[PDB]
Amino acid sequence: TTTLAFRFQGGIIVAVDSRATAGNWVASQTVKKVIEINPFLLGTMAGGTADCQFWETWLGSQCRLHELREKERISVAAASKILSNLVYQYKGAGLSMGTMICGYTRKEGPTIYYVDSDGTRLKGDIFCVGSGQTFAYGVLDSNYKWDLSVEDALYLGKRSILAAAHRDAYSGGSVNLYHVTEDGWIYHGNHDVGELFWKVKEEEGSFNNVIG
Amino acid sequence: QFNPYGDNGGTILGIAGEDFAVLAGDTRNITDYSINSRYEPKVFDCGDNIVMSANGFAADGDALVKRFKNSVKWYHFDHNDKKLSINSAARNIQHLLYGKRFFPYYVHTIIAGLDEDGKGAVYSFDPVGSYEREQCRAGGAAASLIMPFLDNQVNFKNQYEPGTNGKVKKPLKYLSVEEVIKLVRDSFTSATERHIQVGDGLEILIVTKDGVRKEFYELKRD
Amino acid sequence: MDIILGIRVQDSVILASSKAVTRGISVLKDSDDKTRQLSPHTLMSFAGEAGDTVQFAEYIQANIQLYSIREDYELSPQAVSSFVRQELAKSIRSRRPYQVNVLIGGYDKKKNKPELYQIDYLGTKVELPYGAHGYSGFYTFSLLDHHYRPDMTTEEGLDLLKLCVQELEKRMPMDFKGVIVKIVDKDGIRQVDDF
Amino acid sequence: MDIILGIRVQDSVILASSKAVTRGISVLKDSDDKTRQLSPHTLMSFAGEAGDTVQFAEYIQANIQLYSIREDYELSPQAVSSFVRQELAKSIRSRRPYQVNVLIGGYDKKKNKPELYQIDYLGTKVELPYGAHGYSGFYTFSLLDHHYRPDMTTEEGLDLLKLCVQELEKRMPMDFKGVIVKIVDKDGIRQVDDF
Amino acid sequence: TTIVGVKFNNGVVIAADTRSTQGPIVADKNCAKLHRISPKIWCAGAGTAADTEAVTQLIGSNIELHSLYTSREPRVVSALQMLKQHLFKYQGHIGAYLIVAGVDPTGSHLFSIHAHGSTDVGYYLSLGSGSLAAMAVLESHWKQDLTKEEAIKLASDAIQAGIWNDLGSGSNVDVCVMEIGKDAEYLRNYLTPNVREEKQKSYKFPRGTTAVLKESIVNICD
Amino acid sequence: GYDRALSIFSPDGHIFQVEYALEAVKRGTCAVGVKGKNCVVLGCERRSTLKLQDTRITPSKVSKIDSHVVLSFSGLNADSRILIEKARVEAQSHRLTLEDPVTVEYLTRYVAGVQQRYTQSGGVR
Amino acid sequence: SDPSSINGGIVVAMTGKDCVAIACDLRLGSQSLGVSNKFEKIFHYGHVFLGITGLATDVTTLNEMFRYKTNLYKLKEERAIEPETFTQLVSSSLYERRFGPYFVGPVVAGINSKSGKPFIAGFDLIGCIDEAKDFIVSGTASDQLFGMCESLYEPNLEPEDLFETISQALLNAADRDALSGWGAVVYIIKKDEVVKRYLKMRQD
Amino acid sequence: TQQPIVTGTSVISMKYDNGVIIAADNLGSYGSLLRFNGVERLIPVGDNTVVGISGDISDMQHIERLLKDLVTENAYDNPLADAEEALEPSYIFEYLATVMYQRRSKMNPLWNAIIVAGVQSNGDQFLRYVNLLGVTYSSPTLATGFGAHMANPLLRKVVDRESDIPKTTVQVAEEAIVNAMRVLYYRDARSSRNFSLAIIDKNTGLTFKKNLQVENMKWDFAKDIKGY
Amino acid sequence: TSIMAVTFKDGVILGADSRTTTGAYIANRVTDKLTRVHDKIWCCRSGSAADTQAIADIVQYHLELYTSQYGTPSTETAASVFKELCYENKDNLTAGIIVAGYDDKNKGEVYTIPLGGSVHKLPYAIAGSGSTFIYGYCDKNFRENMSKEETVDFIKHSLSQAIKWDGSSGGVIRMVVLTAAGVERLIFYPDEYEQL
């Protein structure tokens, strides 16, 4: 996996790849790694597929129960802490998860929480998670500014996944984009790396290591 | 020390069309270098136009199929005979599998059927419950042989329109039931040639709005 | 986690704690606050196993806050440290022990004295003029042995602390991304923003 | 040892190498030059197991210098790289193999072209526009994939290299105490003193 | 592998299947497991494929030089002695399991050699993963005073047992008949009971389907 | 365990134990709450048949549940301590999991739920 | 730490009507890290082509070793080495290191210049020859290549048609393997002309 | 977690036109020591089912008790216990299969391989296998241990597929079984010469043959074999 | 294996079963475990088939070379060569050999050589996995200076029991008779010895 999400002037960008692997066997190229929890909350998946898929959909059920009980959408902090307290109960049992809980609320504003299976919970502006996280960091950090436009921020998120998809053997398939605003999350399409790499190479002039 | 797991070999394959869906699987059952049975079916009609196969360690496979079949039965009892949709079945199976997260069922599970718009549907699971809908999935011992052939022939991967300078891709289209069965039969004869645990017989289960039909074909027995 | 320091001077306790959170070959965060306020005049820094640290810190925080509400009274640093020690002492013989080391800096309002307690994950408590956990001690202790005096001011203590961080930044293998410094005295807890 | 980078541009090869030498919990030195000049227009940086690195580097240096005196002629970077590869390829099936990874940057005077070769301890050789050994690649490669162009100047290459070091200094766990940068071109080898 | 050896009236016959495996994968569907040590001394080898080929070629080479040196036709016991002393020296690290058979001035002979260097004598023998399937047949149908045509039938039937029942064995049956006073006849693909059926579809692509980036004429000449 | 159903319906559809608990409240010292435009005030009566009291140490009638919520009561004094303790624990538990102090509605809902549970649980009044 | 799967890579060879084809991917990596996309695994010595998968340092070493041995062969024999003969040389050389082997999966391809007969062959790491009428496969995606070749292959394909078949076999196999890909090269080989084509493939 | 102590070797079986045949030798091995010689490893349940068991003998005796108790329990409040509501082969198997899998799932297995052979009420032949792992399968011929490697190849020459079952008489079928038992005595180091055989026919019912012996053995060719 | 050698009035008799095994599979049911190292010096082989074959081949070579130079070797000399190989290579050998021969001066002699490589001269010897089960029987039944027919019955009854209890033993009972008359081979089939 490679997954990222960063905070900026216009809200939150969230970008992921779509590859699943069992050793060196590429099992799938079309895996949804963003979990839609509600119109305002997103969850990213890295690590064990079943662990992430199972417990993040479960997280959604707990968030729905919060808004039924409290007549109010759950905060990003509270949602992330439900997940982090759950995995802490299983600490040592062998769960494998690197997740990011992204969303906007009135009291918090745009917020990103890193939550992993050894119980770490961190608030932050930029996180990359997965086997190809370092490759994504390299491009993302070097090009990140707070003042990025929505158009440029979407591209940088896309371009960072592409960078990792290329170098990391266990990342690839396609890029799934998400923009999170005050109004909620917006889906910005599935982008196959097959076509996207050449399109980006030609138009941007990068990837000179590759035979054109 | 006692090892609670074993490998019973075999392979399975699911393809989806416009108004149908097939779920095939070879009938050979093995342990180590011995054949146990030349005809031991592992693709099952579970009711509500849902076919299912759980390939790998047969004892876990049978246990799972048995539990899902039973889950369908209790769904009818508890919800006024309501038809269990393929998407609902898939989610239910995830919970069956993940329920044993710390002592897993050692199987690749595939289910097929029609979605609620009448269109063909195939879902595939890992041993602990992760799932995904697809047009196409091969599972089991020869999954690594068959799956790349399916990418090339079903989803037209790496195929471009002739003369278009590799710019225009070959367009996606649904395959007829005739064309799909051709691909299934060829996939299994190829798999039988090159994989020792695959052979003896092929059993396909086709799923349309009219019900669940069966077709059987001989495979090489060496 | 990694570096946590503490210095007791004439009229205050000063806690410095590293900002880095590292996992694998990536520094995930460079602004992490490895401390919790237990009461208005008691502060606890912590370091150790991922997840355990914050889970333990917040659990102690909740218990001390509960006590304060129940009795309408603030526990002494000595009383808080003993409670924390016993919790770790229970933990070490549990099925899965908390792997957390803490420093507790407090100002006892009844005695009008600053107090610093060092407690490791086994539940080993000691009151000290200056303390550290992990590899940090191997550099700082000998340095403080030399330069520390019991009658120092808060400003003198911060300069003494700058000397420690400089030595760590020179000789430690890992980049710990600097420290967050906090002071505990008669007026409560406050953070130094420029260090 | 740890960080060694290399960038080939239009008219030169640029090698950056970390300055830190760490042993246990102590940084013993912060000014170590992890490179040897093999010939006037060939430079080799190295990283790996303690002792092995310098022992191997100097052994190669001696052999290339011996060749130069014998033939009154400088071997091509390609010829030097092949010699180095074969020595490592022999080593890997020895009783005790050299655990050393190298980058060889050279300027071929016959072709008037800069050349960069990356060779690991197994004897795996590749010619590259840009290269790295160890964990450094996991950050730099994706960064260079984006920003690198084949027609860049030496000044453009140094800025590209500053971008790599900044990223490493932000995200790497260990303090590697900066880098020594050297340039190889038609006029030979020279060191950048202010980086 | 399944390999056998059977003695008859005026000589000896050996047989083998033609499957080569790579774990569960069939690497070669028609490999030759019958090896010539000398014109009238042949070898069937199971175990590590490179070791059986290499050890058979080395001893075959030394047997030729010995034959030329002594001005005599080579004996089976010479090959047997040279093989077993070589294999014993390497303590089973050379994984060659051989059935050695042939005719010589002394008469007709049948032996087996194991990787650790032990040898056995018999009228009927079988080695390899399918040796139990083969030996079951040999123990059921073998008798004293077999004819040529009866021994060929028995040998091939013992191989077929391995082909059908052992996953390690498959494809065709190779036979070599070594009769006294006659030339040895090597019957490559004596039986071919595993022919691949016609495929359902031609996978000939329209010309231009594959996207190309660069073309260039390669120089093979000087 | 003591299992007896003490709170049960009567022929007319009343739960007498719950209604007799209201009589205990009616016996208790008066308590009043008035909320203004920017504040709430809690007033409480203290009976004067008790002289020679030590007001420093005697339990106060108004209790802090958290730094932002208070609870006064009428009825059995000993019973009120149990509710206050539970409320105080839930207050800290809410801060721990939701990372936000309780609302007054939430804290009330919890206390009210505890009271209700004791009206259809066996062995308790 | 499994030598044959540290670097990654694949090679495949096929036969046709009076022709042979041999293809390979271009990736060289260090486990998950992709390092080079220019690492060709096919070499030739006269008209005899040799592809080598496995541990990259041994690939390089063996190429240099067989170039060495074929050069001395040609000088003494006064003719180019033929595919059948070269196949035997590779087998002998690999088995010489029986208890300290090169971690490789070589594949020979070429047309005999005297008979005109198309010839391919494959080996394991210690020298076992694997001859075939149809196709030979090798590398980290060998299971995938076996499945592609077994279904797609037919006999007596014309050079132009054979190119399509072998290229589709390699591409689709490479895409299902993490350690293979990053570009591909195909060699079409007729009696006295050899065409070399670079394929467009996905770069992830 | 167990290790088997006193063990029983192969159980072999096949279908024929009107029923099923099953056989197993009378040995109870204690490692290499051929300890006990009067052990019956075929256990009839009613007049329509025979359960053949290999593996650990203490566990075999436990299973014997379970089947015995099953017969008793089925007879309770059951007027048709010897008629329509008698124990079928399929009922007996499914019960054992359930137990074997439950025990493996508790990491404390019954260390056995089991073949249930019988005839159903509608005349249909029943033959199914189950082992310590809970793995089940059916085939025209079934065998355990060394039987799987040596008997099945011989029995499959008689009945290779389904269509060969009607064409196979009880005489031909028993001949093959008795032959297979001889081959196992030649080649299995933990086999004995004495065995039991059982036939369940849809017409003639259950026939249980005890104290059979392997005979017509070829040993004469051994005198000609000298040296190595 | 079950093997034994027994001295008697006219010389000595060697006896053995014919079973060779790989685990529980019988690789050879008609094995010949009684082998010639010299005209009238034979040995019984137990342990590894490969090791005992390799050793027996070397000993045969040594005694052939001995005979060329110094004439017929004694049975003691043969046992000394077996010992030298077994003792000096004790770390790399699994061989339990019984050496038996007939001199005209010394008559019948039996030497047993266990795993360690020690030499023990005895009136009769037993060895192999199946020997354990007949120590009791053989001790009670052996008598010195038996006749040929008595010794044949003693060996036949002994190995019959060994075969019956040991799974690693079976097949036919081979015997080799060493006397002044010459060398005689005997075989006994299951149908005879099983029902003793």
Ligand SMILES: *[C@@](C)(CO)[C@](*)(O)[C@H](CC(C)C)NC(=O)[C@H](Cc1ccccc1)NC(=O)[C@H](CC(C)C)NC(=O)[C@H](CCc1ccccc1)NC(=O)CN1CCOCC1
């Ligand atoms: C990048 C793409 C790779 O690291 C990401 O990190 C993704 C995250 C996405 C998919 C949410 N991670 C994976 O792809 C993940 C890596 C992994 C594998 C195994 C354990 C932990 C992490 N892969 C999986 O989870 C795969 C996905 C399937 C194959 C589509 N699943 C498995 O490997 C499963 C279940 C693993 C497992 C976990 C805990 C207990 C038991 C099993 N294993 C198998 O299917 C077994 N295998 C299939 C191939 O045939 C041999 C048997």
Ligand SMILES: *[C@@](C)(CO)[C@](*)(O)[C@H](CC(C)C)NC(=O)[C@H](Cc1ccccc1)NC(=O)[C@H](CC(C)C)NC(=O)[C@H](CCc1ccccc1)NC(=O)CN1CCOCC1
């Ligand atoms: C029947 C068919 C099976 O038992 C026969 O016994 C045949 C004998 C015939 C072919 C001579 N046996 C095999 O086919 C044999 C089975 C086998 C496998 C592994 C070990 C021992 C026996 N197959 C082989 O020997 C193949 C020959 C190839 C297909 C041409 N070789 C391998 O599988 C090699 C084994 C090499 C080896 C090395 C060290 C010790 C022992 C054996 N294994 C690999 O190639 C695996 N791996 C692939 C990736 O690259 C590194 C090696």
Ligand SMILES: *[C@@](C)(CO)[C@](*)(O)[C@H](CC(C)C)NC(=O)[C@H](Cc1ccccc1)NC(=O)[C@H](CC(C)C)NC(=O)[C@H](CCc1ccccc1)NC(=O)CN1CCOCC1
């Ligand atoms: C009785 C049987 C026991 O005392 C006799 O002593 C005979 C003596 C005769 C043959 C001279 N002994 C055996 O038959 C002997 C038993 C044995 C087994 C292992 C070590 C020592 C003694 N059997 C053998 O030597 C067989 C003969 C072969 C089948 C022709 N060889 C094996 O069983 C080999 C031996 C490997 C070995 C180990 C230690 C030293 C030397 C050689 N074993 C295997 O092949 C293992 N096999 C691999 C495949 O998986 C199943 C086990």
Ligand SMILES: [Cl-]
């Ligand atoms: Cl032997």
Ligand SMILES: [Mg+2]
């Ligand atoms: Mg990639």
Ligand SMILES: [Mg+2]
């Ligand atoms: Mg097959």
Ligand SMILES: [Mg+2]
């Ligand atoms: Mg790939």
Ligand SMILES: [Mg+2]
């Ligand atoms: Mg016996």
